[PDB]
Amino acid sequence: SFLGAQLPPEVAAMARLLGDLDRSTFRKLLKFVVSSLQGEDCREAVQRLGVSANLPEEQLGALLAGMHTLLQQALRLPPTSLKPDTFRDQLQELCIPQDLVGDLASVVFGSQRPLLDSVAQQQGAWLPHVADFRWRVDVAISTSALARSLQPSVLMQLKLSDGSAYRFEVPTAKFQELRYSVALVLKEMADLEKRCERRLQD
Amino acid sequence: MRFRFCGDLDCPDWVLAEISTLAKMSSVKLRLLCSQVLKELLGQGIDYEKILKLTADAKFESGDVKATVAVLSFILSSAAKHSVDGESLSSELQQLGLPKEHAASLCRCYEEKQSPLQKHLRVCSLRMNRLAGVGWRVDYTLSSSLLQSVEEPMVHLRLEVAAAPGTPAQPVAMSLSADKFQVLLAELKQAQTLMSSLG
Amino acid sequence: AGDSAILLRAIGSQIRDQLALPWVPPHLRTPKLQHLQGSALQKPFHASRLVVPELSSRGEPREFQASPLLLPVPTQVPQPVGRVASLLEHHALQLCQQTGTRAQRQRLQKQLTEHLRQSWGLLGSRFTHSEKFTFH
Amino acid sequence: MLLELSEEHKEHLAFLPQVDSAVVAEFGRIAVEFLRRGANPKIYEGAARKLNVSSDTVQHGVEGLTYLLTESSKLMISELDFQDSVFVLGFSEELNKLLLQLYLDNRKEIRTILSELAPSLPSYHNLEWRLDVQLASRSLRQQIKPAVTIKLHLNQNGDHNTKVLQTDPATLLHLVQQLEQALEEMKTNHCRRVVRNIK
Amino acid sequence: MELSESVQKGFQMLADPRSFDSNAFTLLLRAAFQSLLDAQADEAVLDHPDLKHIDPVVLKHCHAAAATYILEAGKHRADKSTLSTYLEDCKFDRERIELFCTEYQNNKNSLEILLGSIGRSLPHITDVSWRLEYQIKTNQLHRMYRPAYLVTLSVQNTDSPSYPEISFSCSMEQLQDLVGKLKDASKSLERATQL
Amino acid sequence: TNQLVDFQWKLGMAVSSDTCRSLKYPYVAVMLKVADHSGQVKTKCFEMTIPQFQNFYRQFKEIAAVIETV
Amino acid sequence: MAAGELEGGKPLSGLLNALAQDTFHGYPGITEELLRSQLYPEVPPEEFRPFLAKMRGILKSIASADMDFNQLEAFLTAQTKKQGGITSDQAAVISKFWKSHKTKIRESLMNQSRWNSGLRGLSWRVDGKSQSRHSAQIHTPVAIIELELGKYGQESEFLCLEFDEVKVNQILKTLSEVEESISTLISQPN
């Protein structure tokens, strides 16, 4: 099962609560789960839904926790690996009512999915990225130590997505090492991609 | 399978593996090695020279030595953690396949140091901070530009606080009005009354 | 002990009730779950000095206290958490004060004065090389 | 695959056949000693006078030889590919066999040193935990508030850092669930193929 | 629970039928709770037209006494038996004892939620995320071929200056060690429920 | 450079400390409030002994004498 | 035999000196074994230990009281007139030591009890302002003052202030008010 070898306790709890729940309330809750996955703050809207449904907060918490887990584990699977027929079968082993299964399936496979995939791909980053890169190229004509220098250098400034920024000067012997290193890594990324496509894809 | 010295859990696979490395020593030098590790747990340092000198009996390589000291440290600490007696420890090490003579030796050393071990393990238990000391000065104020005559006491406190053993204490220094000082002392006495009801 | 047995039994049944509820994502937590799972904000203890009416007040001090210029004591702080902290520390000081030698006191103040009198009564590179060699 | 010796790197190594293999064995000894401990230029002027060559001749030959061993160990080049790389140099079988042994004797230790150069990410060291129940505060006198106090120890650049943190019970059950799913991934058929095929 | 002589005299004046009738007692008592719990600092909270005959120095003194006792009773988790004992000591009659308990019971939960919101605490972990990578090469070392885990904890507290995420890396052995520690901690919560 | 916005002082006795039951020495404590560039205002405080005050006060009387005859 | 039995006054003066350096000046690393071996190498360590403790406890009491000669000699005399008490000659050595050290010890206790900043130095100059970039002609003088401050055992800060002839006199009168406050307090007993 896409839920792993042993059913998470929050999913088992939620699946027995669904028998008592009006489909109108289920579909209202499901929107909050999906929009929370896209990063939207929903806390006040959930509270209003609670008193509207007369759900105590102990049951809201169990329902919301169980729905989040089910969608998280399904949406992390590529379309090669979970497909509508096997998803629908596996959810029926949880004894989820068939009408609610259709609503869940529409979230995992319908037109909501591409925006969810975009948000899920953002979470692979762990180190910061280059946000900006600026330079100037200078030639030194004279200096305190030399009447004539005539030596080039590159002044560089990086801004990272961390919000950190660095300004530093690069000797041309050091720029050659940087340029070499970057082209080398690009060759070795391309070689690794060809290993993967010819051995891991089959 | 579950074991008391493991905390009512099945034995870790690295422990069950390295219990078979203990059987490779003589029972007479397995007992001597326990004494060296147990001294370190009691804070009395460790003698790597002696550990290496005796384990040459079995021709251990340094990976054997590392794994042997690690498993003895685990067994002794975890029995003491859960207050397991040497009678239980001997029986349940034998279930894991340690020879009965090696089991014996190992537990007659635990039996001797079980009580001082638990006192040390309580001292080592997680702390966020420790109050290392207190200093104070009381001043009397006579006059000011801001008030022609004052005539009020004032208190200065310096608190030494230690974040980790083997580190210099951080001083927290502050000044207080005599009203602020009175309320602080009275509040600490109420806290202490509650503390004394617990232990 | 019976009193500590009652405490530990109360502790254990609280942990059950907390383990029995799943973790909920922070963007979905209603205010009850915000408290249990730590996403609510606590507010620091901050106390402000109050003005209180005095029944023994007479003359011009009473004429102030009898008027809208002296606000009702808890309403003198805008925020309820600071309002609570202010009343608590105000009442704490009153207990310290009311729960607490004239020759000994006069003697000490005279001892301090002599020390003040006795204390006062003492009144009674190529750049630097170029500078050094050619511009110094 | 094979080593691409630069023309200057070849020209430095051309000193090796100019002297007896017993001296090249000494160059091998001092070469790996420098990798192990650090370089000491004071020996180069000694060997220079002993061999009737310049100190730069000794330095270039020895530092060239260290680089041969370092690049071979970096690549983990096979014995067959090593020979096909070295036979671009003209010298005789005795020196070719000496160099091959000097590589295979030391590649595993050199690779341990070369692993220290990688980009220095922060990493896990240890974790401590304590189960606390809060029973009273200055503002409210009877409570039960259970929390797990956590102390997380980390390495970066060889410097230890520590962070003191808190969880409630239900969050701690979430933390274990997620990081158990992390460990489960290495057992999935996808990651098994990577380990099996990307080697 | 101790109460200063200032607070006790304020209650002794609320106990009078002369100084306060049963109507004024109710209105001042309600104003006491309101001024504690309302977020509006209603400076006119005492301006009820039925309170206007009371001496404004006495009125504002008994109002602060009531509010101070309410906070002290709340903090010490006072039961009705404790409340009724202290009121009868102050010579309250059976009608006003009932009135005070009725207002206190209505507000008890709001007061206890307020008193419990005051404090500072450690940074609270709220979530975790992980990445699995296979390590291929370094500019100094080929054929590394070892997995690493990249772990981030999300902390959510502002009681002291802090940064919201803690990031660190684990080998297979380091992550297996870490998980064992958290399950050891979790096994101790289970034991504590057996108390 | 910096400019004084305000000057305040207090006179006190240090009476007792945990290490020394009878300190009983007087001090003068001064608070200086200074304005930085762009008018940022900050405070600095320091204690003086009574001999130190007498010197501090004595030297400002020298400044006032030279500043007239400059 | 014990160090308390010995009447080596210079060794005892050395012991008191080391005890004062450890206790009040706070010098680290002073320890019983060092003092025994240099001062009294013939005394067994176990016999030296109670004498060290006795001298330390007595000396701590003396410094906290800041004893005058009547107090010092009465207290030491009571220590002489007891079982295992010090000798009168040892007390005389202690008294001679305490006479000089009393000044130094007292000031050290002041520094230990202070954790606000203190005045470390005052320096000043007076300049004639003459011209600036824009003001082609200036003549009014100015005083520049550097104030050195620091906490005990910490690096000094320097604060630099600039004053015109008017602000110099405003500060000067403020200091005269401090002096006249003091003069009143010490005259009030008249």
Side-chain angles (χ1 to χ4, degrees), chain B residues 54-70:
Chain B
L54 65 88
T55 51
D57 178 24
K59 301 183 181 183
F60 278 4
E61 295 175 35
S62 70
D64 297 290
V65 179
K66 289 182 181 187
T68 299
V69 172

Side-chain angles (χ1 to χ4, degrees), chain A residues 140-150, chain C residues 125-130:
Chain A
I141 299 154
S142 302
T143 303
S144 306
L146 290 173
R148 311 94 184 192
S149 182
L150 298 169
Chain C
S125 80
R126 185 182 165 273
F127 175 95
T128 70
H129 292 159
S130 76

Side-chain angles (χ1 to χ4, degrees), chain A residues 36 42-43 47 57 61 65 144, chain C residues 23 26-27 29-30 32 126:
Chain A
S36 178
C42 297
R43 301 192 316 280
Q47 186 179 353
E57 297 189 55
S144 306
Chain C
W23 173 97
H27 291 315
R29 292 177 188 170
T30 58
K32 183 178 178 175
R126 185 182 165 273

Side-chain angles (χ1 to χ4, degrees), chain E residues 93-160:
Chain E
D93 71 15
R94 295 174 180 167
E95 189 189 59
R96 293 182 190 204
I97 295 153
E98 180 169 55
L99 286 164
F100 187 96
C101 296
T102 301
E103 289 291 332
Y104 181 88
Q105 180 62 32
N106 292 345
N107 289 277
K108 188 177 180 179
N109 306 301
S110 309
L111 175 63
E112 289 181 329
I113 290 166
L114 180 60
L115 292 166
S117 72
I118 308 180
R120 281 165 44 200
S121 66
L122 288 172
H124 202 96
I125 300 155
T126 57
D127 208 353
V128 68
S129 64
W130 59 266
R131 270 63 57 183
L132 172 61
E133 61 162 29
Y134 194 70
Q135 304 194 321
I136 306 297
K137 271 172 181 171
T138 292
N139 64 290
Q140 295 285 4
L141 193 67
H142 296 190
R143 309 181 200 247
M144 293 176 70
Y145 300 148
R146 64 187 189 183
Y149 287 93
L150 314 169
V151 183
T152 302
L153 298 169
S154 307
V155 304
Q156 193 163 62
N157 181 283
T158 62
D159 302 343
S160 182

Side-chain angles (χ1 to χ4, degrees), chain D residues 102-138:
Chain D
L102 184 68
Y103 164 50
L104 295 171
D105 288 341
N106 294 296
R107 67 184 181 166
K108 290 190 179 181
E109 182 180 10
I110 296 172
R111 285 184 67 87
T112 301
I113 299 159
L114 293 175
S115 79
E116 298 293 303
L117 302 171
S120 188
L121 307 184
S123 67
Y124 175 83
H125 183 60
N126 194 17
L127 184 137
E128 305 182 60
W129 66 262
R130 193 179 72 190
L131 175 56
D132 296 335
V133 179
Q134 190 195 130
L135 296 174
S137 64
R138 189 175 179 191

Side-chain angles (χ1 to χ4, degrees), chain A residues 44 49-50 57 83 99 106 109 112 115 127 139 145 150 157 164 168 178 200:
Chain A
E44 298 189 334
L49 177 63
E57 297 189 55
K83 65 180 180 181
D99 296 329
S106 78
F109 303 114
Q112 199 72 250
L115 177 55
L127 243 39
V139 185
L150 298 169
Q157 181 164 326
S164 192
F168 58 86
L178 178 63
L200 307 182

Side-chain angles (χ1 to χ4, degrees), chain A residues 10 32 36 40-43 46-47 57-58 61 64-65 68 144, chain C residues 21-34 39 126:
Chain A
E10 66 273 33
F32 294 136
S36 178
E40 303 181 16
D41 182 5
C42 297
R43 301 192 316 280
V46 174
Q47 186 179 353
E57 297 189 55
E58 71 193 56
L64 294 167
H68 173 82
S144 306
Chain C
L21 185 66
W23 173 97
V24 176
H27 291 315
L28 292 174
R29 292 177 188 170
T30 58
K32 183 178 178 175
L33 287 91
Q34 295 179 249
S39 63
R126 185 182 165 273

